[PDB]
């Protein structure tokens, strides 16, 4: 239970996933991993980001959030977002969603926040 950020979350109760310290500036050298899953295999997950969204942009090479369609990091990529504009609504294809936030050494911003729930 040492991990500063991340974890497996059960989506039957809607919750939130945020960069460490949001809305304040996230730390440097971060490497958070989330897995949110639906209780039963038929359901799917839908994410909605908050409009306040500040991640260092450099073609998303340094600070970024990435979303993929499954448990592993090798699942099909749904998006890798940085910059000023929050990403649109994401809807899982299966019943598992992989989320990861990465921070480098230099400059930080407010970060991201999203809310996960079961679709419909």
Partner 1 sequence: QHCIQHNHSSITFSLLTNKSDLEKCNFTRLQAVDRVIFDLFREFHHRVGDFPVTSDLKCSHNTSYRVIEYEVTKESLPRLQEAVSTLFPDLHLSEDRFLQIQAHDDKNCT
User: Which residues of the shown chain bind partner 1 in the complex (CB under 8 A)?
Assistant: 54-58, 62, 82-84, 106-109
> What is the smallest separation between the CB atom of 24 and partner 1, expressed in angstroms?
13
Residue 104 as a binder of Ca ion (CB under 5 A): the answer is yes
- What burial letters (b/e) apply to 2-39, b meaning 16+ CB within 10 Å? eeebbeebebeeeeebbbbebeebbeeebebebbbbbe
Whole-angstrom distance, CA of residue 72 vs CA of residue 75: 6
Instruction: Give the nearer residue to Ca ion in terms of CB position, either 1 or 106.
Output: 106
The minimum distance between CB 22 and Ca ion, in angstroms, equals 14
The minimum distance between CB 81 and partner 1, in angstroms, equals 11
Binding mask 54-73 for Ca ion (x = CB under 5 A): --x-----xx----------
> Which tokens hold the place of 41?
């295999």
By C-beta, is 103 or 113 nearer to Ca ion?
103
**Exposed, middle or buried by CB within 10 Å (0-12, 13-18, 19+), for 75?**
middle
Beta carbons of 101 and 32 less than 8 angstroms apart: yes
Site residues, Ca ion (CB under 5 A): 56, 62-63, 104
């Amino acid at each position: 239970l040492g991990s500063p950020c991340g974890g497996r979350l059960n989506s039957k109760d809607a919750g939130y996933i945020t960069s460490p310290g949001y809305p304040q500036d996230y730390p440097s050298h971060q490497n958070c991993e989330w897995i949110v899953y639906a209780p039963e295999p038929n359901q799917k997950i839908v994410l909605n980001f908050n409009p306040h969204f500040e991640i260092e942009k450099h073609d998303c090479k340094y600070d970024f959030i990435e979303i993929r369609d499954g448990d592993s990091e090798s699942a099909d990529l749904l998006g890798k977002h940085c910059g000023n504009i929050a990403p649109p609504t994401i809807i899982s294809s299966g019943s598992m969603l992989y989320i990861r936030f990465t921070s480098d050494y230099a400059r930080q911003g407010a970060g991201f926040s999203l809310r996960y729930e079961i679709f419909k």
